[PDB]
Design a protein around this nucleic acid. Structure first.
Length: 825
RNA sequence: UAAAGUGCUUAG
RNA sequence: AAGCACUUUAAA
């Protein structure tokens, strides 16, 4: 049966009101039935751009019969839309279109009609809405997307165009926007955000090579390139598109570069009657084209197939404009781009506004034919700044921290329940020359002092201290350390940086060894900063079950008046690699301690294939530490795309239902299902310049919005719960997909904001609630758990196929000592 | 691998 | 290529 998403149970009333601007723009649509036609192109699986050009040419030539004065819109797929009905029948209409010259056949056919009248009735709330191309909001999206997709180079939901800001290496940054539409209160809204990316600069291939290899001058010192030069240049040119200047335009896909120059590059010239004349490329272009090759000492692009084997000098080829860099940018290019692409919050807002002001929607033919009117000014909103919760730390005095501006420090505070660390070891995978014995000795001295001042005094001398240069030497070492020492709290592995040592250390200490490990980079060991040490101590104390702080028992919502558990779930995708799904669960009464379980799943699967069992295990452990039955389950979810919300819900909800049918008997606790997501393109700004926080100029921590830019009838809200420091903050969006607990807007909003302050790894306000963050961490920890076994699967005699049997599910299974604990930090 | 925030990821 | 990069973080 169909599911029923609960509606708005009310709006929020808590917190200081604040005026805001938003990138959402209103859209006037007529309450008119508009007609949808299913378009099929006969050469299948083509680019969307060529399909768009096909239909444009079709409309150009076939208006005498069919389209006439109309100007339909097309999604690049099997969806065309038209304002007035079209003079074609139920049966399809096959038309021929021309475009070396390869024509297409197209079959357009009416399927149904979408009523924007029903949409207008939904947005105003006059009618209750819940009793691909067939929904009307998608048609609005297509109408608004049609024009920019002809003027600008389209990527995904976004649009770019050429400007000049060289990144280096024949690359440049193209600016542009992201466009999206969504139904909000009273009006369709249009999201427009600023984006930029990397493209190959359009220029002669001579200069592209010149810029790739940094041969600043080649004219005056004419040099024939090298082996290393050629390898790098082939790496950077192989796969790209080039145009030929000696023939009007002529475009090829370059697939290799010759090993030898045009002077020495010989091919069998093909004569009529199948005759052969061996000739060199430079000779060929001299005798057929009357072209004195300026650089015949330079190699040639091989554009043709293995049968044809065409050879073009770099001298005549240009880089075709409009090809985006897919291969990873370097460190240098990344730094340069973020130097150029960085915008603070007010800068970003004053960019978006001028951009949408330049778009001139009033003079867009495809907006005019559908009687659209999009608002030119940003959306004015009013939001509420929630009150941050207090946190009780421990010690003799029981200090309490008041988080100002979504941040506090542990300086002067102690853990609620500190732990003594009696037996501990340390393993430097750095060399003797990287850190002297004295360096690590002082490092450990100050770590011990700061730990005692944190209320968690790590006591005594290191039980073990030894260097190691072997990645495959961590399995023996740990084994030794497990048996010689009985009751070892933890070890520390100091690392030189990125290394497989970390992967195998985590794999052993979490699956084989089953003991606590804290890894530290050498620089932080040798350049000591107390803040780093304090965060390390936080992670360690949590790793030994020590509760850092608790949420003040007084300042809490009424939901805590009953045993409640808190769950966060996340799924991470391979890109034929396995997918990883993790779910966590609070173990204590106050939301600080979490256990977790993790499973492996089919690649590219959004839904969580197995859920009930996982929830089962979690619930069990809750009883084990609570002896109580959780009456309310608060499920936080991240990962599901907006396209596939409800059906996932069904299984997941019926899974949790199932997981609660098992425990005891006649057990139906209150389930509340919320989906968190940070991917959206809604960005809220301060309408009052005075209230911008920090140099970034963001909104304050605790800002929430429940009004005219949110959902018409479903229970969603924005909560920018984090200190915005760098640029425009990302307001995490929450959407209530289920509530049996019947909670008001104020209650759930402030609960999520409080959960954003209960993060153990950081004495700050984090963007999303703690269970979701922990689930993400569990996913990544399992991802490292299943890295291809060192010196066994890699380079098996370059990728290696996985082992699908249940041993893969046990390669992610955690040693029993490390499963019940918070090894996530 | 002290951490958070951010933007490039990477999805025709 | 799961992984980069930058900014900030225990003076008073």
């Amino acid at each position: 049966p169909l599911l029923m998403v609960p509606r708005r149970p009310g709006y929020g009333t808590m917190g200081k009101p604040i005026k805001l601007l938003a990138n959402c723009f209103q859209v006037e649509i007529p309450k008119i039935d508009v007609y949808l036609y299913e378009v099929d192109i006969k050469p299948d699986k083509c680019p969307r751009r060529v399909n768009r050009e096909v239909v444009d040419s079709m409309v150009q030539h076939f208006k005498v019969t069919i389209f006439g004065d109309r100007r339909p819109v097309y999604d690049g797929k099997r969806s065309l839309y038209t304002a007035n009905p079209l003079p074609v029948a139920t049966t399809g209409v096959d038309l021929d279109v021309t475009l070396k010259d390869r024509p297409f056949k197209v079959s357009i056919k009416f399927v149904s009609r979408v009523s924007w009248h029903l949409l207008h009735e939904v947005l105003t709330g006059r009618t209750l809405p819940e009793p691909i191309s067939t929904n009307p909001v998608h048609a609005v999206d297509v109408v608004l997307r049609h024009l920019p997709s002809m003027k600008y180079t389209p990527v995904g939901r976004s649009f770019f165009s050429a400007p000049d800001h060289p990144l280096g290496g024949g690359r440049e940054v193209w600016f542009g926007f992201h466009q999206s539409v969504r139904p909000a209160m009273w009006k369709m809204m249009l999201n427009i955000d600023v984006s930029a990316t990397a493209f190959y600069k359009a220029q002669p291939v001579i200069q592209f090579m010149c810029e790739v290899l940094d041969i600043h001058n080649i004219d005056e010192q004419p040099r024939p390139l090298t082996d290393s030069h050629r390898v790098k240049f082939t790496k950077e040119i192989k796969g790209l598109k080039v145009e030929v200047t000696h023939c009007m335009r002529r475009k090829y896909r370059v697939c290799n570069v010759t090993r030898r120059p045009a002077s020495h590059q010989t091919f069998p010239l093909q004569l009529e009657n199948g005759q052969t004349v061996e000739r060199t490329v430079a000779q060929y272009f001299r005798e057929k084209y009357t072209l004195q090759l300026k650089y015949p000492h330079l190699p040639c692009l091989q554009v043709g197939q293995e049968q044809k084997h065409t050879y073009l000098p770099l001298e005549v080829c240009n880089i075709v404009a409009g090809q985006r860099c897919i291969k990873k940018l370097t460190d240098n290019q990344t730094s340069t781009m973020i130097k150029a692409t960085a915008r603070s919050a007010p800068d970003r807002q004053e960019e978006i506004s001028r951009l949408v002001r330049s778009a001139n929607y009033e003079t867009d033919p495809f907006v005019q034919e559908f009687q659209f009117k999009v608002r030119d000014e940003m959306a004015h909103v009013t939001g509420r700044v929630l009150p941050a919760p207090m946190l009780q730390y421990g010690g003799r005095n029981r200090t309490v921290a008041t988080p100002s501006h979504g941040v506090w420090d542990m300086r002067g505070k102690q853990f609620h329940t500190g732990v003594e660390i009696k037996m501990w070891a340390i393993a430097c995978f750095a060399t003797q020359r990287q850190c002297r014995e004295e360096i690590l000795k002082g490092f450990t001295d100050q770590l011990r002092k700061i730990s005692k001042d944190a209320g968690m005094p790590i006591q005594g001398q290191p039980c073990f201290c030894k260097y190691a240069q072997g990645a495959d030497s961590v399995e023996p070492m740990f084994r030794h350390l497990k048996n010689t020492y009985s009751g070892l709290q933890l070890i520390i592995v100091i690392l030189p940086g990125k290394t497989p040592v970390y992967a195998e250390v985590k794999r052993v200490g979490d699956t084989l060894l089953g003991m606590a490990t804290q890894c530290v980079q050498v620089k932080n060991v040798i350049k000591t900063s107390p803040q780093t040490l304090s965060n390390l101590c936080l992670k360690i104390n949590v790793k030994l079950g020590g509760i850092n702080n608790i949420l003040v028992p007084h300042q809490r919502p009424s939901v805590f008046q009953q045993p409640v558990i808190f769950l966060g779930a996340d799924v991470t995708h391979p890109p034929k690699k396995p997918s990883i799904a993790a779910v966590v669960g609070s173990m204590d009464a106050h939301p600080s301690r979490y256990c977790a379980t993790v499973r492996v799943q089919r690649p590219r699967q959004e839904i969580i294939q197995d859920l009930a069992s996982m929830v089962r295990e979690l619930l069990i452990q809750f009883y084990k530490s609570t002896r109580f039955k959780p009456t309310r389950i608060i499920f936080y979810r991240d990962g599901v795309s907006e396209g596939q919300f409800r059906q996932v819900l069904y299984y997941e909800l019926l899974a949790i239902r199932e997981a609660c049918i098992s425990l005891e008997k006649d057990y139906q606790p209150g389930i509340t299902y919320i989906v968190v997501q940070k991917r959206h393109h809604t960005r809220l700004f301060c309408a009052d310049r005075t209230e911008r926080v920090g140099r970034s100029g963001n909104i304050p921590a605790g800002t929430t919005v429940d009004t005219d830019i949110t959902h018409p009838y479903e229970f969603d809200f924005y909560l920018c719960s984090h200190a915005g420091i760098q640029g425009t903050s990302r307001p995490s969006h929450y959407h209530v997909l289920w509530d049996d607990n019947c909670f008001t807007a104020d209650e759930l909003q402030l609960l999520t904001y409080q959960l954003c302050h209960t993060y153990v790894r950081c004495t700050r306000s984090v963007s999303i609630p703690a269970p979701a963050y922990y689930a993400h961490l569990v996913a990544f920890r399992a991802r490292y758990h299943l890295v291809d076994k060192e010196h066994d699967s890699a380079e098996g005699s370059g990728q290696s196929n996985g082992r699908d049997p249940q041993a893969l599910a046990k390669a992610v299974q955690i040693h029993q000592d490390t499963l019940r604990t918070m090894y996530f930090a």
